[PDB]
Design a protein around this ligand. Structure first.
Ligand SMILES: CC[C@H](C)c1ccc(NC(=O)CSCc2ccc(Br)cc2)cc1
Ligand SMILES: CC[C@H](C)c1ccc(NC(=O)CSCc2ccc(Br)cc2)cc1
Ligand SMILES: N[C@H](C(=O)O)c1ccc(C(=O)O)c(C(=O)O)c1
Ligand SMILES: N[C@H](C(=O)O)c1ccc(C(=O)O)c(C(=O)O)c1
Lengths: 743, 743
């Protein structure tokens, strides 16, 4: 149950020939690929070194190879089996495969000063020169793998991921390194971090999947887990109908293995894996294919391998004549090159030490009776040679190896499925995205990029997630972070970012609510013009003399001024046209309702002069201007919020002149003719103005206010002036024009 | 550099006499309390066992005590020093103090079947019977401590905490157990989880404090860290001015130590710590105080302890006459009882094994030449005795001890500061909150309890945090989770949870906008009554006959009906009073504006009958009712949103009768008297109704609509009827009443 080959310098070996026992038993079944192939590779390397005449001339290399059974306690016992004389002496040990096994064996071997070189251990914790003084490895540590994973995650644009870690030293340390690098660099945020137990209860993987489903926006999972755990996680995901939700990124524990995805292709399609660079060795293939029982009795586990390989027992009966790669499928294990490289590194270190310490001698000099551990380690750390794959093998000052990785993606096209190479990582990422075949490019982001107008509220803690909401219609967008109200006296732009020009309305000759007043004003002007023109040629007429030669003219001018008011008050509010128009308002009203030889002079000029200076007083003290009447007319919808242009003569400033003129109109109008017509005129005017209070105040405002008020005022004043002029002169005109003899 | 005392059965020992070296050196300074006291306690226990005649009669117990220097590699070397013959044989080993040291020593000792009993290791990982077969401890594991911490956290009401873990096996495993128990029980949520490095760079602790300050609502920190880390964290917190923000909950690594809080009382006041139950031993105190150099040469580290204790070197020169507890302060280490209990447990196991295997013999029987490890472990697991403090010592089926803890709180009152006992934990919490002195009770909660009306939105993932916001004023509160709009035809209650009764207005005899119509109606009724009463007694009067004996009466009745309309239309909208009132509207209007021997019969009845059947048609086809006119009058503020009561006669349904009556009023009124008065009446009525269109439609609505429309209608109709009646009969009345001879 142990392989011994004699020689002058004896190296050790630890390989996982058997797997962990099911329960209460140390060793279980046989690992054909992981156990037998690697020890056969070590034996082949030793034979090549012994046969080589230019390396370790006349010096033989022996081996003492034992088994670990994938358990650290068994390997601890075997490591104690190594160091017993401290008689043959072990000069070096080819390290174990699992991280825990290597850690415990290195803990033991540091006391007795025995250099150790591993081929499959990647734990970062072994890079500490203050705790593991005599440990080296030909595979890169997991710090480089975590950095590469971060670079891949940030290269595809993802910034929201979850992590899965298998219990132990490997997965937990890898996930911790990834988390620390992510926190230091910044840019990607970790949502959840799970922990697959060593011995899970039934239904554990479904529970893990359901917990991962507590964050639908984290579709990318970083996995540092064993192949059995990967298979069971994929089985649970398939069972829960998530064939397309998750995106997988695996470590070297996934690699290019087929067992975890044997009949679960759809749930694992598009998974990204990372492996150390490696190739196949044809010499090892020929050596292994040349092995038979009659010539490979050096291996003590070879009969069990024969039985478990060809399916017989020596059921079917072994004929002792089968050959590998013919009666069964054959394929190299991926980690043969590393074992051969470790063995050759030890050989080269011994060669250099012999060259320095024992010069010009054939064989082994007496000074070299006992190999010195510390000097041997120093020589190990400074080797430089080309390995079995044509690639250099070198070490750092800590004993690690440079990080050189290849990247694979699982892809399904028609019926052929295979891990396809897409890029590499040699101190810097090189990823060809044009050859990535998912299920265009997917997405794993916490928050979508928002539209233009919002306020971005970064959540406390994680910078990756933001909740963006669109502010009200009364504000604009200052930036992606805040909103502000430009419309203090304006309106916002349609994009809720700018500030639009304010709509405004007016009464510029528009047809609605403005054509009736001018229509009646034209007729009134024509009638008054006809009356006055008829009177002009007949100033000597006896009825004209009875009415007064100039008594009529002033009145006709007054009502003509009233018509001028009723007409040119609808054009536009400005500082040129409607400015100073209210003095004409009052002038026309006072004439038409007051003027009704020198006596005429005084009673026509005195009162109009006093009222003229009065109106002049408040035209000076209260000058006109243009107003923009947004004010309280702030409609909630800006598109429905239109301003208006009006004269600076206020709402109650146009009416002030009327009251004086109203009191002047009441009775100040001064058996004979023309008396009863004046009485009828006064009665008609009184009935006209009785209803004026609701007429002149529509008490509605809204948007009709200017239109309703202007139309009511113009119509009422025009009608009153029309009746006043009419029920006194039209008749006399008819007598003058139609019947000439009645005079 | 090692203590050897001979005997028949030899036990081992591992104690941390020295501390870790600063750099590149295995052992540093001397630990007077942690190293010397515990080994002296073990020696005292061995001497007591040997002197006791009822325990291990005629059998001597020896010891082989070594040093660990607080480093697991040194202890590994010493453990290898134990097992070398596998000649004196080690029957058992008193375990180490640190978790890692015990783990490595137990990994070594499981191979050679040597039972191990520890006194200060609390790591949960050592409770696995499939990995550490020969390990037992007299202190409880950290699972019980984590459960107690969870119970304490949930007992004070806190539900939002942060965790600090020192690098290693102890702190990380404790924090992991706490997190797992928290997740399983549910109710408390972990915000952040930090990691204090073994060798921190300058400024690390300030960075940790600043990271902890990224969550102001998590004021409680669970700490599993070393005393130096505690001191440095407190120093950083004091430097950053957080004297009162954080609340501390520490494990047994804090305990009742004074060094971490030596001159940092204010930053650490109110910290809660947990310790295993223990007491002091007076026998050990007497034994230690009795030691001098002349009689304690068995201890090989005693001279160094003397020098480092009394401050001299044998600077000041040692006189060789000092005594402990007089020339220096003396105090027992807390973990003497556990060491004595472990030694006595091993002794009792050996006693029981001897009693069973070698019966009725004095000394050691030949069958007992070699102690069997597995049977010795089986005997160890089933011991039951009272220890050195009067408390039972027992083991589980895993080798642990029951969880029994005491709880301390650091308190500052005036000048005296001391850890005060507040409660305990023996399979269930017992906490006296009335004696807790903070800085009333503080709080550490993610979200405050919200007021009544909101919608609680539980965040995805953690159930502990909710963001609650108050919905609009148009909705109520269905529950703490959602809002809904009760006011589809109602208003909400003031608490935004219920549904309030809708305010409503009316025109029930209220003084504004309703007293002028009745005031003029009373006068009109009085005038009409006086006129008709005057005519009644004078039906034979010649001017009455000229006016028509019954021609006047129908008209006077018609205008009286108009006054009845103008009056009783302001009372209330119902299905009794304002119902069917519009037939009287039309009846009065048609009389007053149409009736103006058998000829009178036909021209009074025919037209009123046809219009009466007409109005009856739409009173039947369009029956009246009561309306509530919320409709579009939905004011945004419910307090300002009041309804109104109106008659079901629509806005355009009260006017329909008028048009027929208007056309009947136009000219249908049918050299002699009374002709010119009727002409004047017609003219006055025409001028009255000319302005009616804006009068009868105030085009304002708002809230005045009913009032303005009703007042305008009643006033206009009353005034028209008043003028129509007046400008024809008042005169005749004056002739009849005042001047009697004019007839
Ligand atoms: C007699 C009082 C005054 C002159 C008067 C006369 C008639 C009207 N209105 C009409 O005849 C209806 S057409 C013009 C109009 C349309 C809509 C609105 Br609101 C107001 C006036 C307004 C005031
Ligand atoms: C056709 C004219 C009609 C008879 C008339 C005349 C005057 C009034 N109203 C007034 O003189 C003012 S008292 C009623 C009133 C109060 C406030 C508002 Br605002 C409008 C009307 C109403 C109808
Ligand atoms: N990198 C980890 C470690 O160091 O723990 C590792 C080492 C060795 C093997 C192996 O025996 O093939 C595997 C594997 O099963 O893929 C994983
Ligand atoms: N419970 C932890 C552990 O198991 O590691 C522990 C063990 C021993 C000691 C000690 O030497 O006194 C301390 C301490 O420093 O207070 C803490």
């Amino acid at each position: 149950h142990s392989i011994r080959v004699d020689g002058d310098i004896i190296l050790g070996g630890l390989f996982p020939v058997h797997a962990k026992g099911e329960r209460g038993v140390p060793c279980g079944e046989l690992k054909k690929e992981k156990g037998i192939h690697r020890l056969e590779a070590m034996l082949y390397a030793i034979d090549q070194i012994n046969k080589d005449p230019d390396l370790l001339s006349n010096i033989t290399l022996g081996v003492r190879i034992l088994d670990t059974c994938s358990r650290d306690t068994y390997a601890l016992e075997q490591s104690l089996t190594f160091v017993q004389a401290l008689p043959d002496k072990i000069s070096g040990v080819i390290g174990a495969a699992a991280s825990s096994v290597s850690i415990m064996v290195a803990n033991i071997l540091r006391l007795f000063k025995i250099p150790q070189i591993s081929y499959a251990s990647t734990a970062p914790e072994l890079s500490d020169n203050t705790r593991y003084d005599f440990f080296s490895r030909v595979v890169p540590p997991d710090s480089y793998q975590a950095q590469a994973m971060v670079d891949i995650v940030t290269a595809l644009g993802w910034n929201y991921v979850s992590t899965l870690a298998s219990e132990g030293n490997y997965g937990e340390s890898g996930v911790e390194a990834f988390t620390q690098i992510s926190r230091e660099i910044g840019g990607v945020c970790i949502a959840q971090s799970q922990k697959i137990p060593r011995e899970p209860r039934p239904g554990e993987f479904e529970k893990i999947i359901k917990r991962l489903l507590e964050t639908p926006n984290a579709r990318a999972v970083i996995m540092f887990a064993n192949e059995d755990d990967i298979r069971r996680i994929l089985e649970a995901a398939k069972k829960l109908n998530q064939s397309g939700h998750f995106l997988w990124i695996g470590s070297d524990s996934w690699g290019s293995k087929i067992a975890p995805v044997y009949q679960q292709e759809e749930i694992a399609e598009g998974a990204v894996t990372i492996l150390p660079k490696r190739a196949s060795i044809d010499g090892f293939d020929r050596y292994f294919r040349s092995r038979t029982l009659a010539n490979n009795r050096r291996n003590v586990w070879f009969a069990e391998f024969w039985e478990e390989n060809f399916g017989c027992k020596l059921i079917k009966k072994c004929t002792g004549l089968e050959r590998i790669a013919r009666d069964s499928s054959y394929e190299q294990e991926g980690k043969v090159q590393f074992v051969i490289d470790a063995v050759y590194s030890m050989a080269y270190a011994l060669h250099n030490m012999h060259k320095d310490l024992c010069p010009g001698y054939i064989g082994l000099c007496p000074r070299m009776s006992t190999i010195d551990g510390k000097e041997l380690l120093g020589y190990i750390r400074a080797v430089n040679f080309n390995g079995s794959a044509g690639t250099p093998v070198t070490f750092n000052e800590n004993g690690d190896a440079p990080g050189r990785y290849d990247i694979f993606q699982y892809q399904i096209t028609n019926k052929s499925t295979e891990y396809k190479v897409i890029g590499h990582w040699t101190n810097q990422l090189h990823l060809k995205v044009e050859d990535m075949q998912w299920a265009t490019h997917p997405a794993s982001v916490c928050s979508l990029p928002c539209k233009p107008g919002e306020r971005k509220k970064t959540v406390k803690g994680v910078p990756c997630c933001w909740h963006c909401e669109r502010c009200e219609g009364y504000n604009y967008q200052v930036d992606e972070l805040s909103c502000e109200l430009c419309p203090l006296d304006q309106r916002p732009n349609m994009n809720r970012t700018g500030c639009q020009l304010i709509p405004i309305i007016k009464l510029e000759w528009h047809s609605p609510w403005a054509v009736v007043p001018v229509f009646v004003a034209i007729l009134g002007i024509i009638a008054t013009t006809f009356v006055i023109v008829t009177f002009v040629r007949y100033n000597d007429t006896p009825i004209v003399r009875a009415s007064g030669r100039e008594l009529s003219y002033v009145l006709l001018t007054g009502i003509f001024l009233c018509y001028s008011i009723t007409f040119l008050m609808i054009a536009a509010p400005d500082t040129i046209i409607c400015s100073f128009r209210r003095v004409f308002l009052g002038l026309g009203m006072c004439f038409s309702y007051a003027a009704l030889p020198a006596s005429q002079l005084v009673i026509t000029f005195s009162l109009i002069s006093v009222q003229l200076l009065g109106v002049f007083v408040w035209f000076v003290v209260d000058p006109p201007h243009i107003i923009i009447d947004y004010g309280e007319q702030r409609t909630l919808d800006p598109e429905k919020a239109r301003g208006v242009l009006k004269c600076d003569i206020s709402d109650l400033s146009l009416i002030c002149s009327l009251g004086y003129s109203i009191l002047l109109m009441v009775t100040c109008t001064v058996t004979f003719n023309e008396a009863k017509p004046i009485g009828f005129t006064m009665y008609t005017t009184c009935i006209i103005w009785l209803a004026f209070i609701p007429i002149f105040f529509g008490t509605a405002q809204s948007a009709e206010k200017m239109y309703i008020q202007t139309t009511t005022l113009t119509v009422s004043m025009s009608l009153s002036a029309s009746v006043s002029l009419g029920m006194l002169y039209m008749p006399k005109v008819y007598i003058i024009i139609f019947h000439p003899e009645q005079n």
